[PDB]
Amino acid sequence: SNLIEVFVDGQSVMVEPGTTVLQACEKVGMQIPRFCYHERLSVAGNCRMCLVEIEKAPKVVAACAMPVMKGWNILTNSEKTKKAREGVMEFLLANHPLDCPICDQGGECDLQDQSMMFGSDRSRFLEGKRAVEDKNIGPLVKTIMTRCIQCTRCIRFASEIAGVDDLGTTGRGNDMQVGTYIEKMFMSELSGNIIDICPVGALTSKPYAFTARPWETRKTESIDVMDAVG
Amino acid sequence: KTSFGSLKDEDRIFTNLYGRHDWRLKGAQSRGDWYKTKEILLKGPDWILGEVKTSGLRGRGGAGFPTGLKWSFMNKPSDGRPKYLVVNADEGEPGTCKDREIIRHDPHKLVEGCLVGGRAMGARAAYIYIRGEFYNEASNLQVAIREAYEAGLIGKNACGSGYDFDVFVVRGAGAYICGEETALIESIEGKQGKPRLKPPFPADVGVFGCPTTVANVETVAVSPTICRRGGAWFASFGRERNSGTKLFNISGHVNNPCTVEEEMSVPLKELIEKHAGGVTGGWDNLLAVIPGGSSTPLIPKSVCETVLMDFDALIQAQTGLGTAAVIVMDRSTDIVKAIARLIEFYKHESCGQCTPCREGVDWMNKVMARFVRGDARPAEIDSLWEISKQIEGHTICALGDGAAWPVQGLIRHFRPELEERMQRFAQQHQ
Amino acid sequence: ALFVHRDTPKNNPETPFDFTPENYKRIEAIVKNYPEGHKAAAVLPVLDLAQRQNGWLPISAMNKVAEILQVPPMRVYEVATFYTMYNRKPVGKYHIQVCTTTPCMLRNSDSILEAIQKKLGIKVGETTPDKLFTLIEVECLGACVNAPMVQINDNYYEDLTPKDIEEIIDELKAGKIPKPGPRSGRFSCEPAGGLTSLTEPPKGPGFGVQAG
Amino acid sequence: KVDDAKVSPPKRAEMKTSMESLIHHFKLYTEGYQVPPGATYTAIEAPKGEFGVY
Amino acid sequence: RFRGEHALRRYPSGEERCIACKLCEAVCPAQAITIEAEPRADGSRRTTRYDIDMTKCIY
Amino acid sequence: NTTYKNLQHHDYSTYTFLDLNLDLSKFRMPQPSSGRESPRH
Amino acid sequence: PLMGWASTADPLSNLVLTFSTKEDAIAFAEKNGWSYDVEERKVPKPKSKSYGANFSWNKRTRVSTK
Numbered sequence A: 001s002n003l004i005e006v007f008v009d010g011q012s013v014m015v016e017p018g019t020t021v022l023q024a025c026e027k028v029g030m031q032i033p034r035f036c037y038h039e040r041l042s043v044a045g046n047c048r049m050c051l052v053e054i055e056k057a058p059k060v061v062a063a064c065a066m067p068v069m070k071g072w073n074i075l076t077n078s079e080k081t082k083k084a085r086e087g088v089m090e091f092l093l094a095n096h097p098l099d100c101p102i103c104d105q106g107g108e109c110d111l112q113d114q115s116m117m118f119g120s121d122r123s124r125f126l127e128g129k130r131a132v133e134d135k136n137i138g139p140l141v142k143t144i145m146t147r148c149i150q151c152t153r154c155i156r157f158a159s160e161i162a163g164v165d166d167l168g169t170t171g172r173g174n175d176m177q178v179g180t181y182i183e184k185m186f187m188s189e190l191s192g193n194i195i196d197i198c199p200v201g202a203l204t205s206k207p208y209a210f211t212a213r214p215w216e217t218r219k220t221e222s223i224d225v226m227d228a229v230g
Numbered sequence B: 001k002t003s004f005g006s007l008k009d010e011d012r013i014f015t016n017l018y019g020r021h022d023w024r025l026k027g028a029q030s031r032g033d034w035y036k037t038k039e040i041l042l043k044g045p046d047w048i049l050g051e052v053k054t055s056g057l058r059g060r061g062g063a064g065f066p067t068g069l070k071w072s073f074m075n076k077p078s079d080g081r082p083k084y085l086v087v088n089a090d091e092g093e094p095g096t097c098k099d100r101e102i103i104r105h106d107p108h109k110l111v112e113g114c115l116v117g118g119r120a121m122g123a124r125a126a127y128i129y130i131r132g133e134f135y136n137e138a139s140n141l142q143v144a145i146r147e148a149y150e151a152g153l154i155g156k157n158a159c160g161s162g163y164d165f166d167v168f169v170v171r172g173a174g175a176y177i178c179g180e181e182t183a184l185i186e187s188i189e190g191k192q193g194k195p196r197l198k199p200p201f202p203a204d205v206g207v208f209g210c211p212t213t214v215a216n217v218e219t220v221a222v223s224p225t226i227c228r229r230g231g232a233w234f235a236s237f238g239r240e241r242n243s244g245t246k247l248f249n250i251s252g253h254v255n256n257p258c259t260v261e262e263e264m265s266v267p268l269k270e271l272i273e274k275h276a277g278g279v280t281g282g283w284d285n286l287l288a289v290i291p292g293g294s295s296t297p298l299i300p301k302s303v304c305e306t307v308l309m310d311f312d313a314l315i316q317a318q319t320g321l322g323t324a325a326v327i328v329m330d331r332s333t334d335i336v337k338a339i340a341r342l343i344e345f346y347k348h349e350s351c352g353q354c355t356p357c358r359e360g361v362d363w364m365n366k367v368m369a370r371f372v373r374g375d376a377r378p379a380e381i382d383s384l385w386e387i388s389k390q391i392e393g394h395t396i397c398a399l400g401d402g403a404a405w406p407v408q409g410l411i412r413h414f415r416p417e418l419e420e421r422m423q424r425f426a427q428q429h430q
Numbered sequence C: 001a002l003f004v005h006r007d008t009p010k011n012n013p014e015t016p017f018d019f020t021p022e023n024y025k026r027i028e029a030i031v032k033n034y035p036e037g038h039k040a041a042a043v044l045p046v047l048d049l050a051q052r053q054n055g056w057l058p059i060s061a062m063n064k065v066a067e068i069l070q071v072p073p074m075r076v077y078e079v080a081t082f083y084t085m086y087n088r089k090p091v092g093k094y095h096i097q098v099c100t101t102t103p104c105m106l107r108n109s110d111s112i113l114e115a116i117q118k119k120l121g122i123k124v125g126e127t128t129p130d131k132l133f134t135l136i137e138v139e140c141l142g143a144c145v146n147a148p149m150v151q152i153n154d155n156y157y158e159d160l161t162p163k164d165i166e167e168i169i170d171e172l173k174a175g176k177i178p179k180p181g182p183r184s185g186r187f188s189c190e191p192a193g194g195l196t197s198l199t200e201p202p203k204g205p206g207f208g209v210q211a212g
Numbered sequence D: 001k002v003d004d005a006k007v008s009p010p011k012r013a014e015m016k017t018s019m020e021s022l023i024h025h026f027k028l029y030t031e032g033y034q035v036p037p038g039a040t041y042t043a044i045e046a047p048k049g050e051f052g053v054y
Numbered sequence E: 001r002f003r004g005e006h007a008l009r010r011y012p013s014g015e016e017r018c019i020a021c022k023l024c025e026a027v028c029p030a031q032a033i034t035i036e037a038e039p040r041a042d043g044s045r046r047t048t049r050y051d052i053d054m055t056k057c058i059y
Numbered sequence F: 001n002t003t004y005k006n007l008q009h010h011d012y013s014t015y016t017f018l019d020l021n022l023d024l025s026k027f028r029m030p031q032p033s034s035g036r037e038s039p040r041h
Numbered sequence G: 001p002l003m004g005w006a007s008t009a010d011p012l013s014n015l016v017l018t019f020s021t022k023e024d025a026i027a028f029a030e031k032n033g034w035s036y037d038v039e040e041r042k043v044p045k046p047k048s049k050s051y052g053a054n055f056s057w058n059k060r061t062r063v064s065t066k
């Protein structure tokens, strides 16, 4: 009656039909590391981080957008799964600038945490390191577009929640500038909610910009005002 | 079994290579089109699929997926969503002119084949995607569509029977990625050309959400000839996995660089010299041979003097066979420079979905620049080997893979010229 | 290559831009080909009509295409910044594409590059201090089987040499245009030896077939 | 030091031109590297005697 | 390599070398560093208050 | 036949693709709709 | 008033006690005497999304960008 058998490294569990490998892996506790997938949006696949060696397959496949046939076994802690994670994490940090002091996501990065816990240590790629000059999106949202890892999360957020359709990919190859083409100061509702979407330090708060770095500040429960929803 | 195979006349699948007797549906009827096709259509598409798998058609365009398995996936029972046939006609793998010849001298057999493919799987409309480089040949295709419509035999209620089938033509805008399997589909959709993810197949969700498929022009051309001719007459030319005729063309360094139909297997020295002039400077002048085009590793001299031209043979040679640029190159050119220009081409045309092809072609372009100038260490050439092991298959499409393979072939074969180049740079700086 | 607009008028909407009602009938044929429910698929043919009407597309052309196809303009800006046939910089009458990658460069395109350079004067990638000579070198086009090639506005030139460079450029100065086909004889893509192709007039439907 | 940059911080040259080494420098000095759970004991010979640490 | 005075440096004919990136207060094992940061009218990120407690400084 | 049977391509003007698409618009079955007229209606 | 710091007369201000179950939390809080406010655990809600549904035909779930 609508169940699917998978083995997470031997531990059997049941999967509803149509869902992903990733929701079942998060059901058993294993957080497969992700960059483009986010549960409030649709499923892109453009970050490639969620590769996992699924058995009897020479090719290692994504986990955010895989249909779940009956009777899997999912090897998360294998050899070439770790090798693919090392490779992808080495690819991300190539054209990313040395801005971790002047970033605003020092305590709250994603490249930093996942490159400690999953990446390599000795870097490579001696020369190169192109840079994309920033834009002026809005006076409420400070924007540096060199740190953009082109992950296509703000674009999906715009076209699927905001409905404004002002952010887009421009170019090919390495050169993909993400933003608005026409020098237009992007101003709409929920434009303050894009600084929490952007997983790397490429879209930060403008009025907050350089007052603290989030290990000093303590976090406290409270209830919203000014809206009747809270 | 043939002794390695060669061309026997009138066993050509299509005649009228260039400029022959006319260019007309009447000339198509004289060459063998619109002949007894309704009795083939009204027998049942299962018999057409049996005829094609009797011929055993290996899929073209340098992929390897056979047509019979694909169009047997296309036998889904018809729901409320229609079925579409997309005829891809770009020419990547620079060196090609594969179907430029076909769409310039014979669109009528393509019309025959798209009608056959539309009947053989429940398809309803066929979009034919031409490269944007081909305005004049596209207008020749439009004239041929006008002639086939003006005959009153395709469009609505084809072959006299109650079976409508419409064909449209969409131009390209200039890309390598629009030739691929699914970026084609979304380039038709008006969104910018970007491939989808594979485990949702095009035969389940395709052009906006319909079970469609994509055929190469050589498959469309060979398809009505197998229907109108006997079973496995096509299959008697070559081996058992791959079977039939293929365009082996030298677009490159020979005297009179040109195009020939041949069978599936051929001795390579007869192929190069006894059909297309001669090698520039003789057989011993060339440094190496690339088959396939640009998504294929190289083949050196001591391997190219003996290896026959089969798909299984080039699997045994760790390469992949494609079309029309089965060419040699001279010692007088530097293969490092040639492959570096090819990597520059790969950077200039690639979409930016996947991180690894993007950054890998970035590193390989800058590192092949530092190799042409020779400003590196041997750990760098083995690092280029390591990254070419890392990239391959970790993407969506095969452009990253086809950027991995030439680096692989260059490292597997032509180490000593790299070492001498770097030693001469050391002598230059010191 | 500066993928952000940065108006610089002779751009800066509204630049006055409008078509011909005959071209409007072309537009209705184009969005009558594609099925109802997915009107947004004809963006590239309508923008191709805009380029063929006015040789390079301004931003007001993109606003016009967006209002005709009733889409937000951002998809039109994506398709304009994505492909190759659409040059957002203003160009001249004739447009030179010197194609050189794998058979073309390896069959000595650099002689043709030198010939174009020291005949025209302006450097590669740039434009000219007049019209009709916007020169760019380009990647592969498909037509590979001959000498490295030149594309001008919907026409080809193969089997080149610097005297043919002088002839074709002086005749585009004069205005008389040569053929799209090959040169040095061999009137198509030909095996240019002793005619190793078919010679007999082919039979076709007459001889032995089966189940037909 | 060890050649395991996720435990010992790198040096200045790679620190001023890397990316992974700058990230490792930053988070290694802010958070401190994670240490797997468990209880260990060891003891060496201080000049007094058994200097033990648990 | 003696450790004494707790002095600051600056750029060659340039501005203050500090960015206020809070690493020294994140590592300061008696928390004697106190950094409150603001950007100025230019745009480069800088400080307001950079205090060393000489009592707590273990050096 | 060793004579170039083309040059039928040679007269192609820069409008002819849209001209042929224009003139061949008849016998067009209705390109089947789906609910709304557009993704945003 | 001399350096611009945040002093406090609160020794208990920087306590935290990370536990594993709500039952032992409430038991320890009632064992050690003071009052307590229990907020309940909220998991992320499981959803139903698919890439083919992002490529719909006559359903409005359409990606509209890629």
Ligand SMILES: Cc1cc2nc3c(=O)[nH]c(=O)nc-3n(C[C@H](O)[C@H](O)[C@H](O)COP(=O)(O)O)c2cc1C
Binding pocket: B058, B059, B060, B061, B062, B063, B064, B065, B066, B067, B070, B088, B089, B090, B091, B092, B093, B176, B179, B180, B181, B214, B215, B216, B217, B219, B295, B397, B398, B399, B402
């Ligand atoms: C890297 C790559 C490049 C391709 N380039 C072209 C091309 O230029 N033209 C084309 O018609 N198909 C091209 N294709 C598609 C293949 O020809 C593919 O085999 C085709 O969709 C179906 O061919 P088959 O069914 O005969 O195997 C390309 C595919 C890939 C992966």
Ligand code: SF4
Binding pocket: A147, A148, A149, A150, A151, A152, A153, A154, A155, A178, A197, A198, A199, A200, A202, A203
């Ligand atoms: S701006 Fe941020 S969210 Fe948007 S694509 Fe770039 S990294 Fe992703």
Ligand code: SF4
Binding pocket: A096, A097, A098, A099, A100, A103, A104, A105, A106, A109, A110, A111, A112, A147, A199, A200, A201, A202, D023
């Ligand atoms: S987003 Fe980039 S610059 Fe910012 S902390 Fe992370 S890696 Fe450093």
Ligand code: SF4
Binding pocket: B177, B195, B350, B351, B352, B353, B354, B355, B357, B358, B395, B396, B397, B398, B399, B400
């Ligand atoms: S490998 Fe590169 S060119 Fe191919 S789909 Fe991925 S990003 Fe695009």
Ligand code: SF4
Binding pocket: E017, E018, E019, E020, E021, E022, E023, E024, E025, E035
């Ligand atoms: S905040 Fe501290 S660590 Fe950072 S630049 Fe200033 S003095 Fe150096």
Ligand code: FES
Binding pocket: A033, A034, A035, A036, A037, A044, A045, A046, A047, A048, A049, A050, A062, A063, A064, A065
């Ligand atoms: S999470 Fe699956 S690829 Fe981004």
Ligand code: FES
Binding pocket: B094, B095, B096, C099, C100, C101, C102, C103, C104, C139, C140, C141, C142, C143, C144, C148, C149
């Ligand atoms: S490389 Fe010049 S045409 Fe293909």
